[PDB]
Fold this protein.
Amino acid sequence: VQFKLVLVGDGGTGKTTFVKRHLTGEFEKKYVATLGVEVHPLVFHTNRGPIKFNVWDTAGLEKFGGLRDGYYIQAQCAIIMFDVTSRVTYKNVPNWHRDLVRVCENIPIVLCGNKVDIKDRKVKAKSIVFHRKKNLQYYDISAKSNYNFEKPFLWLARKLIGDPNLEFVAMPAAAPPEVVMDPALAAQYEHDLEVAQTTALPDEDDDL
Amino acid sequence: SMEGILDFSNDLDIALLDQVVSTFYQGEGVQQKQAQEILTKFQDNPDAWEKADQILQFSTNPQSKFIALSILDKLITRKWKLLPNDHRIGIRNFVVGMIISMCQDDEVFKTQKNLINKSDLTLVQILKQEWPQNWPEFIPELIGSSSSSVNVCENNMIVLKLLSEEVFDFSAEQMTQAKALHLKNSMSKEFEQIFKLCFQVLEQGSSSSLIVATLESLLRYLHWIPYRYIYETNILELLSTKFMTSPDTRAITLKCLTEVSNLKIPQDNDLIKRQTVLFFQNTLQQIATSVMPVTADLKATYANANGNDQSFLQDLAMFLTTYLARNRALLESDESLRELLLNAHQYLIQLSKIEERELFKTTLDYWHNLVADLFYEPLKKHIYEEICSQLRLVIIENMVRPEEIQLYKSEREVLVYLTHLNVIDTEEIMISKLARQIDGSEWSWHNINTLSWAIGSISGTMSEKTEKRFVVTVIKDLLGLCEQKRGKDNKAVVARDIMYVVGEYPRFLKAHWNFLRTVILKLFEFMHETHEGVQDMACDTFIKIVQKCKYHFVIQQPRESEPFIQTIIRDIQKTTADLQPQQVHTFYKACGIIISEERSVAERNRLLSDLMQLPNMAWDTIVEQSTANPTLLLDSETVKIIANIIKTNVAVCTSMGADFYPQLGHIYYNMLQLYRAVSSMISTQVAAEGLIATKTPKVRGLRTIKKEILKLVETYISKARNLDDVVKVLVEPLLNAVLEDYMNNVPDARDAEVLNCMTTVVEKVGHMIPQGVILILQSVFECTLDMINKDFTEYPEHRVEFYKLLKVINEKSFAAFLELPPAAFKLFVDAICWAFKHNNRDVEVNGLQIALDLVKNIERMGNVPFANEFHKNYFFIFVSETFFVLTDSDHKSGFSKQALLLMKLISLVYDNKISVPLYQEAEVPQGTSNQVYLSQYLANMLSNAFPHLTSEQIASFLSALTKQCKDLVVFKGTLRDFLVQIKEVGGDPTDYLFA
Amino acid sequence: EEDEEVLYKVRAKLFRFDADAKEWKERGTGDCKFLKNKKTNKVRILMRRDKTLKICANHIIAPEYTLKPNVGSDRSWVYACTADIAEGEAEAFTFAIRFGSKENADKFKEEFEKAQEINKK
Ligand SMILES: Nc1nc2c(ncn2[C@@H]2O[C@H](COP(=O)(O)OP(=O)(O)OP(=O)(O)O)[C@@H](O)[C@H]2O)c(=O)[nH]1
Ligand SMILES: *[C@H]1C(=O)c2c(O)cccc2C(=O)[C@@H]1C
Ligand SMILES: *[C@H]1C(=O)c2c(O)cccc2C(=O)[C@@H]1C
Ligand SMILES: *[C@H]1C(=O)c2c(O)cccc2C(=O)[C@@H]1C
Ligand SMILES: [Cl-]
Ligand SMILES: [Cl-]
Ligand SMILES: [Cl-]
Ligand SMILES: [Mg+2]
């Protein structure tokens, strides 16, 4: 059970960062602009079985746009992303919506205002009305604090499976193997450990 | 082999292209990725358009044809006007032929909607270029070709919808004002013929797909067409009856009727009023008979989410709220429209119970509009009694916590208005909801919390007497609920809700001292409960009650021996003994609020002294030991005590401001010695352990001391009233302690908080310390610039604080820049332009503001050598850096301020504020005015940067732009027209004459 | 997890060292659990992410493992894991786990040793 999900929005809104947090659990701090599209399989475990999103993470910058609406063909669902700290990114939501629906007329679409962790919010709640007449779901999210980070997928999954009570569930956890550390690679591990202990964990001010 | 399509030397193999595309869309992992890079390079090849007609004729893969049309779209939008007329007609005929052909084949029409819609959009891109001037017959032929087939008729409605969107909905950013006006007038002129065609299909149409495509185009027409096409034809009746009855057409029809409700309409016309009423009556009758009655459980339906129910219910909410916000007064005065009015509202009540936050917000905006009107408008509230009663229950059951600021605000305001309209009904609903908490039927943490937020939200709406009886009843009830609940989780929830409600009723507290005291003493008892959330809630409630009731803590109450502030302070050690440090600081912050109420100077200083007794004694013993032995700071546990002392000083200074000065005076000299001692230890640790030292808990602890010292001083100086004392006592020791330490640390050890503190100093007393501002610049300018002038990402806090500092120095103490040596002044101008190129919007905005202010500062100087040398050195750098960021597409959030800066620079030359010639001698005739030369320099600069523009385009642009150097909105329009024309070839130069 | 007793539960953020990029990469945040298999009496770390409940750690608390401090933190441990099955096929990782406080981290170290001694039997 796999669905093509297209992720669109202005450069620097957090599309690649959001997907990576979902893929690996990591928070990428650096901005490396996507070139055309990155495709990644993303699987969730539900009470109704596993659901797979083939996530088409598209380029937001015109100069790295590649095939543009060429990426939208046979999309079954979409996320439009903006940055609540950048007014221009919300101003552009109608442009991304336009390009998307001209190719995909009848697909569930979530509008996501990313970076709600930042204290100086520029696109206020009151301003975000574009979703109403377009029947988009809307969520405030933060890829950084993980605020509502599961909501866009849980909503799309409910729409695509056609079950409003669909829940994410704990994947059953296989018994981990007992192994003995190899005497040959014992010296190797000490090195790798030394480097890791003398590199600081990021974000030492955070609650975790 | 996939890379073969990239070699254009040989003719394209369609079969290979179809494999690459297939591999891209249907392949996986490594293969998909390589096909992606290859298709991208193919598409981006500037000659790939020459392959489009070959791909469209001979490709089997409809994805290939899609990508071919994108390649064609790039040519049509960018380079169309370079093509000979015969080649443009060739492409036109080819595209129209492919559309008509795909429509005539029932199988392709049905299954290839993607490619047909992309073709239609490609055709609309040709119409934007060619129509009507080079294609006058387009509309007559489209209208003609529509009667030949139902597939072509349907597809022609898609073309007209796309044409309407492109000309009216999406033209603002994508065309020049002149071109948008031309296409709008052109569609307006031909609309009578387009409408006839749409009306005929709607009147006589048999095919649902055709009918839906026609209504989809109509929804686009309603954004711009005059009202008479809706009201003076049969169309209103067809929308509000026939098309509401069938579920194929019902969602699009409801969206049309929402847009009809927004048409610009005459106000003074009984017949139009009757038609406006009639289409509403017809639509609600079709809903009640064909979809669901007024009693239907829409919450249940929406939840079940069968087919398109969720979209339809959202569309119904939008239609009802839009029509009623404009028209409910048409329904209010006539007895025969009463049932229609209340049915429409009853549907809105049922929509408001749906569990869907974004829908709830749409309906809440309508309810806010309605209850605000009932609050002000005479003889209206009685109509809506039953709607209002139901709405009270929907709002109370949906109240969110105050942390969800916008939603809580909207809900509170609606509930406050409803409470005014019928206080008894609000009170009864709240008391009976509390009874269902106590009897357990509706008991849950979420439910008691929700009810508590609702009860809190209406504070101040009742009379003091009604409020008193109400508050007593609620506290009595919540206390009974508390006693009745088992286990500390349940008791903590109810305790939190009691504290919450009490904190929202200050008026009650201020009139009942005996109760206020008990509340405070109970909050003090709760500060010893380590059960999660209880201490934090006790402290938050304490400071919230203090902010509102502070005067009651500072007077001697009758039957008390002293002001309660004295009682709080005396027992502060015991009260706060079990709190986490951040909770202690909140507690001390709250005491500072109270002490600031005492306006007797001697009594305030004495209270401040007593409040600071514990941190001052811990401080004094640390300083005794610290001065005796330098090594004692190394100890992790002392560093934590020192930081918490400084944080307590920051917390009290935060609430006391100017009144904090005697406490700052007591610690100031040893605090700055501590700053220097801590700095040496950090320097010592970095030398001994490396840059890694700055990540260690020990050094982060020491840095915390330095940051809290800076935060204390910036906190005081930002609220200081006696600036003479600031300048005479605080500023010299502060600069001595911080500036050299900042300058002589390695970049990674430098605190951006120094820049922030220095900004506050220059802000508040910059005019009184001109030599101090010079010293600040000399200490921080060149070394901070070197941290941030290598990329846009390193040292983001320094980057931000650095431009805030230059901004305020340039505002308050521009003399410091005159004292800079020329090389340093050049670095300053370079730094400003650097801020312009930033994607960081804090920096970019300060950058543009510094540039604006610097112009004004230089202008102010008048006709002297410094000003003259500045213009000769930097005028053209500022003009070209501003043009660069206006045109490169990477800085669109700055557009307004970039335009303002460019206008100001251009206007300097027009107003003869630049005395010397800006051109070096023998570059032009020696008499030539700077005004004439500016235009020559700009033409040359635009010609090099944009070589595809004609001389005529640049000269017309510059003639328009310069003349609008006083009018910012028109100036911005000219710039936007230029940003459109630079994206294409052969832009019309007469576009710059738009008016 | 129905055949296992919970010996210890604590909120934590888990990192894995990427030697290539020479940086710590977050793997997840949620409840870290010491689970005692009721058949074998073997104690594992099982850690699930908030909201998704996806597994970010699943490995035996091997007696050979040693919790080391990180230079940046007084509320973290780093240790080498020979065989973690969170992402499927058993892999070697250098892990770091950070807690809300020094107290939680010391308590974790205490439980991780008590678990190592159960796993020696
Ligand atoms: N504060 C904050 N920063 C975030 C958040 N999400 C992403 N970022 C940062 O913002 C930038 C976003 O980068 P990407 O996720 O690569 O942006 P993108 O939308 O993929 O951009 P393109 O690929 O160019 O379209 C990075 O620096 C992220 O670390 C968030 O929730 N909060
Ligand atoms: C297009 C069309 O197909 C049609 C149908 O289906 C019925 C009646 C009239 C017509 C037209 O002529 C429309 C223009
Ligand atoms: C529980 C309770 O919360 C309470 C507060 O909060 C103040 C005063 C008295 C009480 C009780 O006795 C309740 C049982
Ligand atoms: C102002 C202006 O800047 C200008 C320049 O710079 C050149 C020529 C004409 C003008 C104007 O007429 C504007 C009023
Ligand atoms: Cl018009
Ligand atoms: Cl009205
Ligand atoms: Cl008062
Ligand atoms: Mg990206």
